[PDB]
Amino acid sequence: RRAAPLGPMPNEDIDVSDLERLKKYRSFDRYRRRAEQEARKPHWWRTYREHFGEESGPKDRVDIGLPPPKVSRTQQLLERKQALRELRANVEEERAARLQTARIPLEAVRAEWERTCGPYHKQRLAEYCGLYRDLFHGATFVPRVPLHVAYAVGEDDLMPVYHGNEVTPTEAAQAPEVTYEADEGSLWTLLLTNLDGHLLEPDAEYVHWLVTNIPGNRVTEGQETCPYLPPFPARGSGFHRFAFLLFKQDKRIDFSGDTRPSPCYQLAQRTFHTFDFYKKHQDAMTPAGLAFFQCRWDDSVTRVFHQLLDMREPVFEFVRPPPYHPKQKRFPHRQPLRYLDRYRDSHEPTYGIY
Amino acid sequence: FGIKKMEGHYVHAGNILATQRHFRWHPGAHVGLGKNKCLYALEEGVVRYTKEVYVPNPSNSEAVDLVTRLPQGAVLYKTFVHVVPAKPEGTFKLVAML
């Protein structure tokens, strides 16, 4: 009983008649490539992708963006072309190349990456750690604006927040320094959200520090709704993730329901859903910049719960399911003696009536 | 010789999926190979079968040379077995509140 192929059958296209006249890949490599090409299309038969959770596959992106920066095509193409003509033309450069000594001014690279497709790397990095899942839930924004966060670790020291990097609450005890650039017609609201680590409510998060109505680059001038509360992970569960977000507001918004007490160390007082808070102010607030860090329990955190929240310190563990053993048999056949100790309740001789 | 487990069968770690004299089914994701060319479950879960691309190890010559002479449009395919892990890796429990 033969069936009929549904759509294309993979190799059918090439002619078996006259194999000698067909070109080959003599290279393991070429093959590898063409192979992975075929690994990336939607085949009509059960495939790895299908079962292994490509995570929803195609998604129609709900996009709340800062609309794309508008520049002209042919202009930049020409300018670039010329810059290259200049560069290559240089003989000093080619001498530097043949003899294999050259270096790249990594800082300038940081600047230009920051300038062109860097905001996209940001995007897919946030998408990597699931920022969109837990915050805006359906949606994708592009970090048009660079957001630079940091902590002074000493008089001379600064530990910055890149997206994704790991930071200690030793450095998270103090308010962060923030740099981004705009003129002042600007109205801003910047948010620090703790995506996971909420004790009672799996679907909810903690806002440590939240600012509102920030003119231009002015940091302290912004009216703070939520004063700064240091990151407080749990001893057991390692590596919470903390997010710095930037919204552009058009008209100054004032919300007293969002406003919190000034000391505010009580944990029920910070209970938060970026979803709902943004549903509120959506028409005014447009998502802009992104930088976030990974943080796990550290000693200083012990000071928090005792000193700050009048709380006991939760400690957690990691529990892997007890191993699977088959229904015990009355007569284990052909089994190692130690089979018996598999089903052992606990280890102790138990003399029932003796 | 033969295929001991089927698509959609639930498995535990170590159960054999298939046994063969020549490679007919190759191990896919989460399926460990024995030296007798047996396929067994490395992780508890569901067994899935799937046809996928064949990209041999360069340490294996014959394989390599099979790749070498092929026409430039076409790619080799083989059948695989995998396990979709069911039980989560682990869980976080509250040990003590100090």
Binding site: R2, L6, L19 | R69, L76
Partner: peptide
């Protein structure tokens, strides 16, 4: 597997003739 729409997926040797 003969009865499937996919029978012959792995089939190659018509592709390289070393005889």
């Amino acid at each position: 597997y003969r009865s499937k729409p996919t029978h012959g997926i792995g089939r190659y040797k018509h592709l390289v003739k070393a005889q």
